[PDB]
Amino acid sequence: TEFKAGSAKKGATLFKTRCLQCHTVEKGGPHKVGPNLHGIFGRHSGQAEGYSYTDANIKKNVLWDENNMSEYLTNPKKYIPGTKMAFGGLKKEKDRNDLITYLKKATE
Ligand SMILES: O=S(=O)(O)c1cc2c(O)c(c1)Cc1cc(S(=O)(=O)O)cc(c1O)Cc1cc(S(=O)(=O)O)cc(c1O)Cc1cc(S(=O)(=O)O)cc(c1O)C2
Numbered sequence: 001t002e003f004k005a006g007s008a009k010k011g012a013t014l015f016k017t018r019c020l021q022c023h024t025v026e027k028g029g030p031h032k033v034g035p036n037l038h039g040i041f042g043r044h045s046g047q048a049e050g051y052s053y054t055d056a057n058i059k060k061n062v063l064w065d066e067n068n069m070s071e072y073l074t075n076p077k078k079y080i081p082g083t084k085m086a087f088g089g090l091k092k093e094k095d096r097n098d099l100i101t102y103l104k105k106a107t108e
């Protein structure tokens, strides 16, 4: 995938409707079904303090960046088979760019 900076404003709404059910973004925010995502970019997968991940998410050991995040969010279980993230994917490229643009800001 080839991430292109988009609209964090539209990304924020996508996060609310598609991700917030299972994730927080703020520093020190609580885990839910999924891990809090603060600091995700530039850290390896499966490392949020205090959260119990699948073996798949840990052993994937990917250094998250905007491009591999775009691939992941297209189809999570294809990128990380054995994941327990029950999310089908954002099939639209502009949605992925906008969501990732938001996520970069929100998880800083
Ligand atoms: O306000 S924005 O900065 O987000 C904006 C950027 C672009 C835009 O063309 C528009 C808004 C108008 C517009 C908005 C939306 S919305 O996010 O749903 O509100 C959707 C579209 C649109 O033209 C339609 C559209 C959809 C898709 S798809 O989801 O991938 O199928 C792609 C595009 C669309 O125009 C092409 C496109 C991509 C991108 S990208 O950020 O490079 O992916 C920016 C802009 C684009 O027109 C350039």
Ligand code: HEM
Pocket (backbone or CB within 6 Å): 015, 018, 019, 020, 021, 022, 023, 033, 034, 035, 037, 040, 044, 045, 046, 047, 048, 052, 053, 054, 056, 057, 073, 082, 083, 084, 085, 086, 087, 090, 099, 103
């Ligand atoms: C597009 C919206 C979403 C985004 C941006 C997102 C983002 C992420 C990211 C980046 C990871 C990897 C975290 C890491 O490696 O530390 C992850 C894992 C996870 N997510 Fe999501 N997610 C979304 C939707 C969801 C939804 C809707 C759910 C719940 C139904 C969910 C539940 C989980 C779970 C359980 C994990 C850990 C998976 C595992 O251990 O295998 N996510 N998510």
